[PDB]
Amino acid sequence: AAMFSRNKPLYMTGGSVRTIATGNYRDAAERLRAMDETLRLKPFKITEKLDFRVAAYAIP
Amino acid sequence: SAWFINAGMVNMPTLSCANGYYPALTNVNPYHRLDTWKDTLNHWVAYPDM
Amino acid sequence: LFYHSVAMIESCYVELGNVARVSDSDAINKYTFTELSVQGRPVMNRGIIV
Numbered sequence: 001a002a003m004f005s006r007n008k009p010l011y012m013t014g015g016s017v018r019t020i021a022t023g024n025y026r027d028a029a030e031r032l033r034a035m036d037e038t039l040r041l042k043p044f045k046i047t048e049k050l051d052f053r054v055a056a057y058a059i060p
Numbered sequence: 061s062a063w064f065i066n067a068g069m070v071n072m073p074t075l076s077c078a079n080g081y082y083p084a085l086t087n088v089n090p091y092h093r094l095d096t097w098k099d100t101l102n103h104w105v106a107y108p109d110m
Numbered sequence: 111l112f113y114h115s116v117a118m119i120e121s122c123y124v125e126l127g128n129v130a131r132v133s134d135s136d137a138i139n140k141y142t143f144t145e146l147s148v149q150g151r152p153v154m155n156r157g158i159i160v
Contacts (some may be wrong), residue, residue, distance in 0.1 A: 033151075035151075037150065037151060038150065039148065039149075039150040039159065040145050040149045041148060041149075041159075042146075042147050042149060042151065043147070044138055044143070044146075046128060046146065048120040048144065053131065054131055054132055054133055055128050055129070055131045056132065056136065057132070057136075057137075057138035057143070059138075059146075078140075083153075083154060084153060087151065087152065087153075087155075088144065088145045088148040088150075088152065088155050089145075089146070089148075089151070090153075098142075102134070102135045102136070104136070105134045105135055106133070106134070108134035
């Protein structure tokens with residue numbers, strides 16, 4: 001596919017166009033974002049290593 | 061020396077951003093394709109001369 | 111409330127002590143310790159969330 005304007009190439013820019021279906025939006029309505037809107041803050045256990053001057057946090 | 065006679069063109073993208081207007085769109089749970097998406101900055105900030 | 115207040119500020123200022131002593135080149139660092147912990151949808155990571 002090629003397009004020309006003013007004897008110069010006209011290039012298509014922006015995002016990738018998809019084939020929007022009725023189901024693609026109403027599955028997110030079926031989902032509703034059913035994650036109970038409750039601010040659950042999870043902790044980080046500090047872990048000490050050779051230097052000790054600098055700190056390092058782990059996930060569990 | 062034939063490579064470096066004619067000036068090569070550097071394609072700089074147009075500067076646009078709409079985070080300042082709508083700060084609701086940027087929150088604590090961001091979308092990323094790769095899980096190693098913060099490695100390049102973490103590398104530069106540690107070792108700039110690399 | 112006096113006892114609940116001192117309990118909260120003592121908990122915060124102790125942890126900000128050993129958060130200030132981590133290098134930026136790391137997973138959970140100075141800038142990105144709030145985002146990974148929070149599992150909700152607040153407007154902006156400020157105030158009581160931090």
